[PDB]
């Protein structure tokens, strides 16, 4: 889930590029 | 009387007996007199002697555990005054930790010019509480007499006669064979001779003739040419305000010192020029310096070694240093800040500098007023700068926050691998060593290793701002071999400064002041960057970006860096106004005080306020009374050596496997009111109601014209105090005399209840009997419009009524006298 | 460091501003 | 019998898919296997065809750049054993730049004899946490599973199995959604198991067809002959590839085939150890007698020339290349690029080299802490040399701090200087020891003595604390007097110290760390002597910043100037764990006094701020406190002690209801010394029943309308009585309440109602103590007279 | 970049030819 | 061979064609 | 550290063990 | 003697060893 990588962990620049449509 | 012998300079007698005898020839102790460090003498290794020539000591007398001293009549039986022009811990007479001394032997000591006296830890000394100090000193608080055997009254006291003019304790004395001198009221505090006569004011201590200036033992104001004068004509300068020393004597003192170098100023041969004066050369004239000039603390014989931060505190409040320094301190948290506070005010150094065998530093800039090293003292081999045996160093002194110039001596950079060659070149260029026809000696063969010296610039391609974040993007950057790139290590810090550099703060072992973020290599072109994870609104931050690169055996670098940028985050609403305090001191005066927002988020245009009106509660009338960023996983989070080594080793392993495979795979061919307060932490409100509640809302605001964005509501309720107009019945009391004996006591409610009425106390007393209490409740009052005395016996009944409420008490309505008749 | 809710949507906005996002 | 196919030679397949047909005409592949640059396959090319042959591969596997390969079973659904005779860069399976693998397809390979797996550059890979690496990998040689999708999520390492917990994963172990893991006992996991999950014979390997039978298997562990797994075969047969046996005809055929060389790599075949090997190992001269390795006659050194005149080793594959060679012509480079430890394998594969005629470079070591791979190098010819004339090069090495023993291994370097630069982990002691043995006698070489020994313990002399005095605030140390032969090198000492709860402190490496870091170094000033005693004979240091009762691990090193001498590299003092003395027990923390009843008060406290010594007992003191008395001038109208050892809660019992109390809590670590008193105070709850009027109100009536009231104070007043609510009540009239003050009650033994009227009256009185309100007393009746 | 190594090298070489193959060792 | 020429220094298309057979 | 008065006396007593106290 | 050398600058072990008698 998005929370696992951004809430529980830290999302980098390119990390959030995979959650954009 | 006049000094019989010749003056001798101050001396420190330690482990010597001949030096003790030398005091006999002495007549004036021009300087301090130390009697210390005698661990070789015993009571069978000493003697008794009298010094008839010594009559005065110009400075303090120090006694320090002198073995073999049983009394103070063995060394000086003639001393009279201890002027103490110099001081030791503010005491002009110091006897510290002196034992086997059973008594003292002074016979002429009757005055002290200035200073104090210390008598402590002397558990074997006697006659120390039988000495007056109204004639020797000018106060009784300028001598410390504690931890003494005579301060406990365990000592035996004897004195001459049953003849001494002196007034357990019997008379003022110092020894069985010597005493203190008491003299009549027509004398003065400038001493009085043993005979029992007075002495003049120009004299000091005992005196040969009563009240005569021509004959004195010592002069308090001045001494010159054989007579007690009150001034010193040229070129004789005032010496310790006790004599006159010609210019030759002061110059001789100067030559012998460089005791402190002697200066001439105010027609006085004083040791140091006061603050505010520059040292005119070849005359030592303390001419008024232009502007405030810190005193110059010269270096003994032009040298000072610093191996600990304690010695670095010996330069405090100085500008010019006469000599060389050797800074070789290692260790300690935030060493650079310590050195900046220790010597940040040292304007120039006339000596050479050595940074040999130094550690726990990352830069050499710990000065903030230096722009020139004189280098008058030269190291063997024509060298004025020195750097030896150092394993860590990332910088030298910058040219935009520090200036420097060198006029003599070669440069020296040895065993400084992290010190890049370019820094050495810049030093050679700016300093000017080559310009003045000089050639330096360096160790560049062992320098420039294990430190990035070749850098590239990163150009920002797109940037935008938010209220709590700053997005950054830079032009795609790739090393010649893309495998070198391992990502980027961004370093940011809160920087209000506009000339921020990465050498601000830290510069010591285990100290850091720059936060760090890590970003992966850009994907395959996508512009690399990084979005901050929240920030403080309206605050600027310094940010740059470095690039990790694969390193060879000696040194290899494909590195690039970014310039310092100060981007501010837009503002948002501010926080709650800290500490709302609505305090009253009257029923029509309330002060609303508050503190600014914890997070202002830009200047506060104004402070918004709201409040609602209240009223006395009605119920009272019906009542009767008679994992996450918050916890943290790293609070500073630098990459460790082990991590960088593992990263580099794995990167290399991967590259090696790749090349290995490639080499075999491929082969060639074969409504609430409001108010606004602008810039104020106070508010005045007047013309209020008494005993009324006021609930005041308080917010802060950072913008007024573009839109109203303010802090979240804050509330505080203040209750005004009640005025006192309800302590007695307001208005008259309606009553009538009946034959039923029923006295229905009517009365009107006061103008205002000031909240509610607790009760009414009514006292009915026939002929003024005991005063009774009768609970007149709110409901009973409303029902009967007061009270109702159902029947009374005949008699002159006096009725007093007190409106007991929260408005105060302590007074009753005057008694109404009604004569009941049945 | 971490991002959730409002902070995460604002990040998805600033990071992806040339193309639409989803949450 | 056990292999349903021919024995094909190793194949290399690039681009064309036609050669893959040969994989279906044989089930045994001698050699390695590589499938790469497969740029013509599509998903329909790996799903409409599958090779049912291939059981065992003797050397390794290499799948790289394969298009549309989504499972391992799509190519070989029956591969069972990888013998690992040779490796590929310390690996026996490699996955590189694969962009179509989404699941595995191997479920009959349970043991890798030599090597590891190299999974890298995969971004669609699933199922890598359900493979039970421990069960498969029984050897670990730098196994790195990186550049995958299991650190992010693609599928989530889940499938619809035994689900055993052996690697720390509680999820089902599987290889495909239609497949599950195969488990067998570990006692029978090094010899392979059957396809039923039970034990198998020890002369079989991998998959088996009959559990615990060597007659029917799918692979053999020792040798394969007669279609049965045996332990050895008759010698009219010779073991080839070490997995089978074959008669002499095949051996002589191979020998004849290479007689006239037309094959680049073939060597005339011979037989040693009852095997048809390509070339006899050193010590056996290659002379045919019937193709047998006959004994050597005189010196038979094997000069194994190396390519490039230099060879760098970072993998055991290159090392095994030169096994069985005695004389080496050329140089070499040691470069440990990451990975696991290899020194044991290095000595195992190169320990037979006894002579080198070149130089030897060493750089970036990551697994060598001690050099142990050469125990035979006695003569270094050095016929080739670096420009600089260095026969040895030591650069960028931060893992080595040891060298070969010098009482069992010799080394006489006949030429070239010894290069040693930027090696702080390597100590100058061993450097000079070898400078003395090699001799290139004794000769000073260009070696920087300021770049080696800066981050390691290289001291060679030693100190011993002669006088030690321990105290709560001052720790004095006095070690043996020591000065180097040159009495101008002593620049002070290094008092290393750090906090230790218990002795677990291992001596530091030897670098310089200060600030808030572990093992805080503290420079000590030189004694300023000639090493002759002037007033002292024991040099040391008296540190005084210590706190009471705290143990510190402290050792001392020595800094001296460098020289070209073997000695004078500094001294080292032994390590000591100096526990300081306890003189303060410390102030207790957070005292909590709370009353739980009218005679029960519970106390609380936290352990002292600083634990110094064993707490021998806790000291408490308390006594009855009285209240403030002000009702006679105003009107509103030793000490008990207990000792509890190692307790954090206490309750007071024996107190009276109401009145304040004062308690003091002190910590003690002797029995005596105690800490400063801590003050806290609470009062018991008051008993409202004890404040109720006792006895009835007597009425001394006198006709002055004076009804004197005789009531009595409560049975046990709480503190004292503020006042009395004497509420007399005349029926048929307004209720009244009289505030009888304490002063009036004392003066008149109660009150005296005056100003009354005649008739039946009823008085109720409620006594009020300082705190707590009692209850109304009975309404005593009296007929007031006039 | 402009250098050819690893992934870049193989993705830069495959461009040249993919229908003739490579030399067989 | 390929790495020493293509990685260390720049390879032209002629160098790449060397490995096409 | 700094040694003065009583502290210096204490330190001199404790640190020395070969000679008596002199100060 | 020893006061002026240990109360103006940090004291040292050898400084105390010279005044112990």
Q: Is B533 on the interface with C (CB under 8 A)?
A: yes
Angstrom distance (rounded) from CA B22 to CA D384: 82
How many whole angstroms from its chain centre is CA D751?
Answer: 84
Touching check for B475 and chain F: CB below 8 Å? no
Sheet holding D678-683, edge to edge: D641-644, D617-624, D660-668, D678-683
Distance, in Å, from the CA atom of B672 to the CA atom of B690, rounded to the nearest integer, reads 20
User: B354: helix, coil or strand?
Assistant: strand
Kindly state the tokens that stand for B514: 């720059």
Question: What are the distances in angstroms from CA B616 to CA B691, B748, B754?
Answer: 8, 19, 8
Report the gap between the CA of B487 and the closest CA in chain A (Å): 12
Residues B59 and B33: their CA atoms lie apart, in Å, by 7
Distance (Å, whole) CA D135 – CA D206: 12
For residues B790 and B765, is the Cβ–Cβ distance under 8 A? no
What is d(CA C16, CA C22) in angstroms, rounded to the nearest whole number?
Answer: 10
Question: Which residues are paired to D709 by β-bridges?
Answer: D699, D751
Query: What are the angstrom distances between the C-alpha of D219 and each of B602, C6, D81, D186, D664?
Result: 78, 61, 7, 18, 83
Q: Are residues D91 and D123 in contact, defined by beta-carbon separation less than 8 angstroms?
A: no
The CB density around residue C21, as the number of other CB atoms within 10 Å, is 17
Which DSSP symbol is given to D628? P
Q: Does E8 touch chain B (CB under 8 A)?
A: yes
B550: nearest Cα among B458, B653, B405: B653
Strands B61-66 vs B28-38: parallel, antiparallel or unpaired:
parallel
B635 in reach of chain C (CB within 8 A): no
CA dihedral (D375, D376, D380, D383) positive or negative: negative
Rg of chain E over Cα atoms, rounded to whole angstroms, equals 10
Name the burial class of residue B141, with classes exposed (0-12), middle (13-18) and buried (19+) by CB atoms within 10 angstroms of its CB. Answer: exposed
Q: At what angle do helices E6-13 and B641-665 cross, to 10 degrees?
A: 30
Question: B533 by DSSP, 3-state: which?
Answer: coil
H2 lies within 8 A of chain D by CB: no
Q: Are B134 and B156 in contact (CB under 8 A)?
A: no
How long, in residues, is chain B?
Answer: 822
CA B174 to chain centre: 45
Q: Which helix (H) or strand (E) holds B62?
A: strand B61-66
Is B324 within 8 Å of B377 (Cβ atoms)? yes
Residue D211: both structure tokens together? 């559990």
* Closest-approach residue (CA) in chain H for D539: H14
Closest Cα in chain H, distance from residue B510 (Å): 25
Bridge partners for D118 per DSSP: D94, D144
Distance (Å, whole) CA D743 – CA D629:
12
CA distance linking residue B449 with residue B555, whole number of Å = 5
Nearest to B784 by CA among B749, B819, B821, B808: B749
Give the residue carrying structure tokens 């696992």.
Answer: A4
Contacts of B471 in chain C (CB under 8 A): 14-15
Residue H2 distance to chain G (closest CA, Å): 7
CB D731 within 8 A of CB D782: no
Q: Are B476 and B489 in contact (CB under 8 A)?
A: no
To the nearest 10°, the Cα dihedral for D117, D119, D124, D127? Answer: 30
Q: Going by C-beta distance under 8 Å and a sequence separation of 6 or more, which residues neighbour residue D220? A: D2, D203, D204, D205, D214, D229, D230, D243, D244
Q: Which residue(s) pair with B91 in the sheet?
A: B88, B116
- Asked if D476 lies within 8 A of H16 by C-beta distance, the reply is no
C-alpha–C-alpha distance, residues G1 and B309, integer Å: 12
G12 and chain B in contact, CB less than 8 A: no
Query: Does residue B142 contact residue B134 with C-beta atoms inside 8 Å?
Result: no
The CB density around residue D146, as the number of other CB atoms within 10 Å, is 12
HEC-encoded secondary structure of B426-444? HHHHHHCCCCCCCCCCCCH
Distance (Å, whole) CA B493 – CA B515: 6
What is the arrangement of strands in the sheet containing D465-469, beginning at the earlier edge strand? D465-469, D475-479, D540-543
Q: How far is E17 from chain F (nearest CA, A)?
A: 6
Mark whether E and D touch (3+ CB pairs within 8 Å): yes
In the block, tokens 């016929």 appear at: D383
Q: Which domains does chain D have, with CATH numbers?
A: 1-183 (3.80.20.20), 237-295 (2.10.220.10), 315-438 (3.80.20.20), 470-561 (2.60.40), 589-683 (2.60.40.10), 689-784 (2.60.40.10)
Return d(Cα D542, Cα D478) in angstroms, integer: 9
Q: Which of H16, H14, H13, H12 is nearest to H2 (CA)?
A: H16
D244 contacts: CB under 8 Å, gap ≥ 6: D7, D220, D223, D224, D225
- Which residues in chain D touch residue E7, judged by CB atoms under 8 angstroms apart? 97, 121
The rounded distance, in Å, linking the Cα atoms of D490 and D483 is: 7
CB atoms B531 and A13 under 8 Å: yes
Strands D412-413 and D379-380: parallel
B36 interfacial to chain H (CB closer than 8 Å): yes
**Tokens of residue D320, six digits:** 């095994």
Determine if residue B449 is left, alpha or beta; phi over 0 gives left, psi from -120 to 50 gives alpha, anything else beta: beta
Tell me which residue of D403, D395, D334, D412 sits closest to D371, measured CA to CA. D403
For chain F, the distance separating the N- and C-terminal CA atoms, rounded to the nearest angstrom, is 16
E22: closest CA of chain F, how far (Å): 5
How far apart are the C-alpha atoms of D669 and F10, rounded to whole Å? 78
CA distance G3 to H6: 5
Q: How far is CA D571 from CA B212, D480, D494, in A?
A: 75, 11, 10
CA–CA dist D299, B487 (Å, integer): 57
Quick check: helix, strand or coil at residue D546? coil
**Residue D190, Cα to own-chain centre: how many angstroms?**
29
CA angle D347, D353, D359 (to 5 degrees): 100
Give the residue among D456, D447, D364, D347 at the shortest CA–CA distance from D401.
Answer: D456
Contacts of D536 in chain H (CB under 8 A): 14, 17
Task: Record the tokens describing residue B225, joined without a space.
Answer: 């040419």
- How far are the Cα atoms of D304, D411, D412, G4 from residue D301, in angstroms, in the given order? 9, 19, 19, 80
Phi-psi region of B89 (alpha: psi -120 to 50; beta: other; left: phi over 0): left
Report the half-sphere exposure of B247 (CA within 13 A, side-chain side).
10
d(CA D214, CA D228): 6
Cα separation, B105 vs B75, in Å, equals: 9
**What is the separation of C-alpha C10 from the centre of its chain, rounded to a whole number of angstroms?**
4
What is the rounded CA–CA span in Å between residue B731 and residue B154?
82
Instruction: Report the candidate in B820, B822, B783 with the shortest Cα–Cα distance to residue B799.
Output: B820
Quick one: which H or E segment has residue H16?
Answer: helix H13-17
Q: Spell out the residues 6+ positions from residue B280 whose beta carbon is closer than 8 angstroms to its own.
A: B286, B287
Q: Residue D10 CB: number of other CB atoms within 10 A?
A: 14
Distances (CA, A) of B697 to B47, B595, B676, B700, D543: 90, 14, 12, 10, 60
Interface test with chain C among A8, A11, A12, A15, by most C beta carbons within 10 Å: A11
| Helix segments in B402-524, DSSP class H | 421-431
Helix (H) or strand (E) holding D37: strand D33-38
Chain C residues lying within 8 Å of A10, measured CB to CB: 1-3
F19 vs B668: CB contact, 8 Å cut-off?
A: yes
Say how many CA atoms lie within 13 Å of D33 toward its Cβ: 25
G22/B97 touch (CB, cutoff 8 Å), yes or no: no
Q: Which letter, b or e, does each residue of B142-163 get, where b requires 16 or more Cβ atoms within 10 Å of its Cβ?
A: bbebeebbbeeeebebebeeee
């Amino acid at each position: 889930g998005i929370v696992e990588q951004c809430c529980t962990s830290i999302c980098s620049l390119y990390q959030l590029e995979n959650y954009c449509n | 009387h006049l000094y019989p012998g010749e003056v001798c300079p101050g001396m420190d007698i330690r482990n010597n007996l001949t030096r003790l005898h030398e005091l006999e020839n002495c007549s004036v102790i021009e300087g301090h007199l130390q009697i210390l460090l005698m661990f070789k003498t015993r009571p069978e290794d000493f003697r008794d002697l009298s010094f008839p020539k010594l009559i005065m000591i110009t400075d303090y007398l120090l006694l320090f555990r002198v073995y073999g001293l049983e009394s103070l009549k063995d060394l000086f039986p003639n001393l009279t005054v201890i002027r103490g022009s110099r001081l030791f811990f503010n005491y002009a007479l110091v006897i510290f930790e002196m034992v086997h001394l059973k008594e003292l032997g002074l016979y002429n000591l009757m005055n002290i010019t200035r200073g104090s006296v210390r008598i402590e830890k002397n558990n074997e000394l006697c006659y120390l509480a039988t000495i007056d100090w109204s004639r020797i000193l000018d106060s009784v608080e300028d001598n410390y007499i504690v931890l003494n055997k005579d301060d406990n009254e365990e000592c035996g006291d004897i004195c001459p006669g049953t003849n001494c003019p002196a007034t357990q304790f019997v008379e003022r004395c110092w020894t069985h064979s010597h005493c203190q001198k008491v003299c009549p009221t027509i004398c003065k505090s400038h001493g009085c001779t043993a005979e029992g006569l007075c002495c003049h004011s120009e004299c000091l201590g005992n005196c040969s003739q009563p009240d005569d200036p021509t004959k004195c033992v010592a002069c308090r104001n001045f001494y010159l040419d054989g007579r007690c004068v009150e001034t010193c004509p040229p070129p004789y300068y005032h010496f310790q305000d006790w004599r006159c020393v010609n210019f030759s004597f002061c110059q001789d003192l100067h030559h012998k010192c460089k005791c402190h170098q002697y200066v001439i100023h105010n027609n006085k041969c004083i040791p140091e020029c006061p603050s505010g004066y520059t040292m005119n050369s070849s005359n030592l004239l303390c001419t008024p310096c232009l502007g405030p000039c810190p005193k110059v603390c010269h270096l003994l014989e032009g040298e000072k070694t610093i191996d600990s931060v304690t010695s670095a505190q010996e330069l405090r409040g100085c500008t010019v240093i006469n000599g060389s320094l050797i800074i070789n301190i290692r260790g300690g948290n935030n060493l650079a800040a310590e050195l900046e506070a220790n010597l940040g005010l040292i304007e120039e150094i006339s000596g050479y500098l050595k940074i040999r065998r130094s550690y726990a530093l990352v830069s050499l800039s710990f000065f903030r007023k230096l722009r020139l090293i004189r280098g008058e003292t030269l190291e063997i081999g024509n060298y004025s700068f020195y750097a030896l045996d150092n394993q860590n160093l990332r910088q030298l002194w910058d040219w935009s926050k520090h200036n420097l110039t060198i006029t003599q001596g070669k440069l020296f950079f040895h065993y400084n691998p992290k010190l890049c060659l370019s820094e050495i070149h810049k030093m050679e260029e700016v300093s000017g060593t080559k310009g003045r026809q000089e050639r330096n000696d360096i160790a560049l063969k062992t320098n420039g290793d294990q430190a990035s010296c070749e850098n590239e610039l990163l150009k920002f391609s797109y940037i935008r701002t938010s209220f709590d974040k700053i997005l950054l993007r830079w032009e795609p950057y790739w090393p010649p071999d893309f495998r070198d790139l391992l990502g980027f290590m961004l370093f940011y810090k809160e920087a209000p400064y506009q000339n921020v550099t990465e050498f601000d703060g830290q510069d010591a072992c285990g100290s850091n002041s720059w936060t760090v973020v890590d970003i992966d290599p850009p994907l395959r072109q996508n512009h690399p960057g990084w979005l901050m994870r929240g920030l403080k609104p309206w605050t600027q931050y310094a940010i740059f970006v470095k690039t990790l690169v694969t390193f060879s055996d000696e040194r290899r670098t494909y590195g690039a860096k970014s310039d310092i940028i100060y981007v501010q985050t837009d503002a948002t609403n501010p926080s709650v106004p800290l500490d709302p305090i609505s305090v009253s001191n009257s029923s029509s005066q309330i002060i609303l005080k508050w503190k600014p927002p914890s997070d202002p988020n830009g200047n506060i245009t104004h402070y918004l306020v709201f409040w609602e009106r209240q009223a006395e509660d009605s119920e009272l009338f019906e009542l009767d009374y008679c994992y996450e960023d918050s916890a943290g996983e790293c609070c500073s989070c630098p990459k460790t050596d082990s991590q960088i080594l593992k990263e580099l080793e794995e990167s290399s392993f991967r590259k090696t496997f790749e090349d290995y495979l490639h080499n075999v795979v491929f082969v060639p061919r074969p409504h609430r009111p409001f108010e606004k307060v602008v810039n104020k932490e106070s508010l005045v409100i007047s013309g209020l109601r008494h005993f009324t509640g006021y609930r005041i809302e308080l917010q802060a605001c950072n913008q007024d014209t573009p839109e109203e964005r303010c802090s979240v509501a804050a509330y505080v309720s203040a209750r005004t105090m009640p005025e006192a107009k309800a302590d007695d019945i307001v208005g008259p009391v309606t009553h009538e005399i009946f034959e039923n004996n029923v006295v229905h006591l009517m009365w009107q409610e006061p103008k205002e209840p000031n909240g509610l009425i607790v009760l009414y106390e009514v006292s009915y007393r026939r002929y003024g009997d005991e005063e009774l209490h009768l609970c007149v409740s709110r409901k009973h009052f409303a029902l009967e419009r007061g009270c109702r005395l159902r029947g009374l016996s005949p008699g002159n009944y006096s009725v007093r009524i007190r409106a007991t409420s929260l408005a105060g008490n302590g007074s009753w309505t005057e008694p109404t006298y009604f004569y009941v008749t049945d | 460091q971490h991002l959730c809710g409002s902070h995460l949507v604002e990040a998805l906005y600033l990071v992806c501003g040339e193309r639409g996002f989803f949450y």
